[PDB]
């Protein structure tokens, strides 16, 4: 029932961390979370939002001055310049957010695939990749096996014999 | 046996617009726009603003008798004027170069 | 007797977001004016509860 979800859709039981494994085993069921990729994603997102927000400053002025019935040319000029600025700013903001909302999603959906490719490359051939999103080991190993495969210390030669 | 990979997902129902698809739902978001006003004037630093109710700048300078100044004033940050002022100049007249006088009295200490 | 960073004829403003759409006339330190109805940024994933 632990269907992999990085293609179908995310799970619900995970709370801490965005990307996480599912360290299923005998009498060892229970979710987890990768301790490195989430931190990098958090740093990236914070940097993007900070760069977007804190790049502007404002001063003491705004639209609105009074004129009599003889200065109509100045009133027309003031309206023209105010409308020009009021158009430029909206266009810039709209295009900025519309462009960023796609790049961030692409980055978030590429990170998971990169993690899956890494965990696949680590397990050279002992993994019988179903294709639904995750593997199924041939040899039997305890929770230390899952801890190693998360950490990145799993090796072929020691467990090679039992695979065949 | 199966070390399966997934990602977090919850029931948060929000909507953002991308350059490819429209009206897509995401787990978190941050809003860059606000539409909220307290509804009443506050103190913009300084000390306090003036309250020229039922009066006008052209009537406070000359001291219209039925405006009675503003009791007493010493300093202010900005002026507040009713959009439809009754008491201006009681004696009919024509204030010369009145428009620039508002600029001169916009910011004083 | 409240205090605020800037003000508008319709009232005071308490937020510090880099945009606003209530009114262009302002005195003080407050963001620009934008006619767009609503805009927001995304800092998450795709929400498919499977």
């Amino acid at each position, epitope marked *: 029932g632990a269907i992999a979800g990085f293609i179908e859709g995310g799970w619900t039981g995970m*709370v*801490d961390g965005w990307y996480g494994y599912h360290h299923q085993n005998e009498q060892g069921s229970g979710y987890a979370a990768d*301790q490195k990729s*989430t*931190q990098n994603a*958090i*740093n990236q*997102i*914070t940097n993007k*939002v*900070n760069s977007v927000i*804190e790049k502007m400053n404002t001063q003491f002025t705004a639209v609105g001055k009074e004129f009599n019935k003889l200065e109509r040319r100045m009133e027309n000029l003031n309206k023209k310049v105010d409308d020009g600025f009021l158009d430029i700013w909206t266009y810039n903001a709209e295009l900025l957010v519309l462009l960023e909302n796609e790049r961030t999603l692409d980055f978030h959906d590429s990170n998971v695939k990169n993690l899956y490719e890494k965990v696949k490359s680590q397990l050279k051939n002992n993994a019988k990749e179903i294709g639904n999103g995750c593997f199924e080991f041939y040899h039997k190993c305890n929770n230390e096996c899952m801890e190693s495969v998360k950490n990145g210390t799993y090796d072929y030669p020691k467990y090679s014999e039992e695979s065949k | 046996d199966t070390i399966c990979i997934g990602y977090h997902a919850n029931n948060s129902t929000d909507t953002v617009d991308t350059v490819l698809e429209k009206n897509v739902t995401v787990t*978190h*978001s*941050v*809003n860059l726009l*606000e539409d909220s006003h307290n509804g009443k004037l506050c103190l913009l630093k300084g000390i306090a603003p003036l309250q020229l109710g039922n009066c006008s700048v052209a009537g406070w300078i000359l001291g219209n008798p039925e405006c009675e100044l503003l009791i007493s004033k010493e300093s202010w940050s900005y002026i507040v004027e009713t959009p439809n002022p009754e008491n201006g100049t009681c004696y009919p007249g024509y204030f010369a170069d009145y428009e620039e006088l508002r600029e001169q009295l916009s910011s004083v200490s | 007797e409240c205090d605020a960073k800037c003000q508008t004829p319709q009232g005071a403003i*308490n*937020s*510090s*977001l880099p945009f606003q759409n209530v009114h262009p006339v302002t005195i003080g330190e407050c963001p620009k004016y934008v006619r767009s109805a609503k805009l927001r940024m995304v*800092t*998450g994933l795709r929400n498919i509860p499977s």
Partner: antibody
Amino acid sequence: VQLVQSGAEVKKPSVKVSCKASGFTFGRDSISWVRQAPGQGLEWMGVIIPLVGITNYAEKFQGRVTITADTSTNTAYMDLSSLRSEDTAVYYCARGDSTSFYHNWFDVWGPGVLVT
Amino acid sequence: IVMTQSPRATLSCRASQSVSSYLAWYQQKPGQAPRLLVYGASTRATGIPDRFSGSGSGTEFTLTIEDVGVFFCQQYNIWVTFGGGTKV
């Protein structure tokens, strides 16, 4: 920088404490909340990065405490529900670090708010 | 993770699980919010008169030494948990 709070919150047996940023504009922060029992050591309650909205709660206190953020007013609340008679304790408002979201040490602390 | 306290001042906080160099020592006067003294058990922090310091890693660390009250030892290698209060 001193993190101001709401004030006394004495009520009969929902509760909404509040925190606010002062002196420093809201940025890379990891506001965390610690509950000091009257005669026991400090416990841990949650952690939030308001600039992104990523929440994370302790192991025991998942089902009750729901820390939420508010970017507009630079605040962070609780929505502690189903209050008991054994939760009477002071609730601080401690800052932290954002580049070390899984290894956080509290640097700045708030004055204190009573809850009973 | 459970911790145990220590009943020219030397205080120690036994750790029931491996911690390496991830602690920080908290000192507070009665009635006020605590303040951070040192973190990493070796890297001195700001606001310190150099009167007190700590040492050790992967084992209980000795905190060698106004400074009257209660001291707290905190670990941040698996979530965060606090130890017992010092009796000084």
